[PDB]
Amino acid sequence: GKLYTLRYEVEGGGFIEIATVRPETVFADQAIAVHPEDERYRHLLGKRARIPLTEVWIPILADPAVEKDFGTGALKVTPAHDPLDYEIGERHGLKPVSVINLEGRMEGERVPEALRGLDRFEARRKAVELFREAGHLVKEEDY
Numbered sequence: 001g002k003l004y005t006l007r008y009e010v011e012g013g014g015f016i017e018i019a020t021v022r023p024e025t026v027f028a029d030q031a032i033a034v035h036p037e038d039e040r041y042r043h044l045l046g047k048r049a050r051i052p053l054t055e056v057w058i059p060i061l062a063d064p065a066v067e068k069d070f071g072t073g074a075l076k077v078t079p080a081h082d083p084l085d086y087e088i089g090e091r092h093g094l095k096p097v098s099v100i101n102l103e104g105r106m107e108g109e110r111v112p113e114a115l116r117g118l119d120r121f122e123a124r125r126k127a128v129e130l131f132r133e134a135g136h137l138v139k140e141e142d143y
């Protein structure tokens with residue numbers, strides 16, 4: 001597998017970078033969480049970030065469960081698809097949004113048209129290319 005670092009547009013200008021090994025779940029993001037003491041993102045608390053390939057904006061919020069040394073230190077939170085995110089979601093009242101159905105296929109208005117209906121694994125590969133082509137892929141690392 002690979003680790004992808006994506007740049008999400010920030011309200012007012014600029015970007016915040018997030019790392020993930022599950023690029024296909026980006027569309028289910030409900031928040032970007034950062035540790036309240038992280039100087040890299042403190043000034044972004046309270047502003048919003050736009051999910052790549054969508055017109056959806058999500059809050060950049062503070063949560064002490066975030067590890068500054070993991071990934072970029074900025075954690076994309078998808079309550080519907082990760083157990084820790086679910087807890088962050090509970091702490092902040094986030095609404096879980098799922099973009100992968102029980103049969104394992106991508107679904108939902110927030111999912112890019114070219115990805116709807118694809119099985120999760122093919123969607124992962126394709127999502128990376130859509131991100132790359134659109135200028136959201138900062139980098140990729142091999143395990």
Ligand SMILES: C[C@@H](O)[C@H](N)C(=O)NS(=O)(=O)OC[C@H]1O[C@@H](n2cnc3c(N)ncnc32)[C@H](O)[C@@H]1O
Nearest residue numbers: 020021022025066067070071073075076077078082
């Ligand atoms: C699917 C995403 O929405 C999910 N947040 C996630 O991180 N996906 S992941 O598989 O790339 O990440 C693996 C695990 O490491 C956790 N993790 C990654 N970065 C951090 C961080 N900076 N602080 C705390 N946990 C982290 C993720 O929440 C998840 O539990």
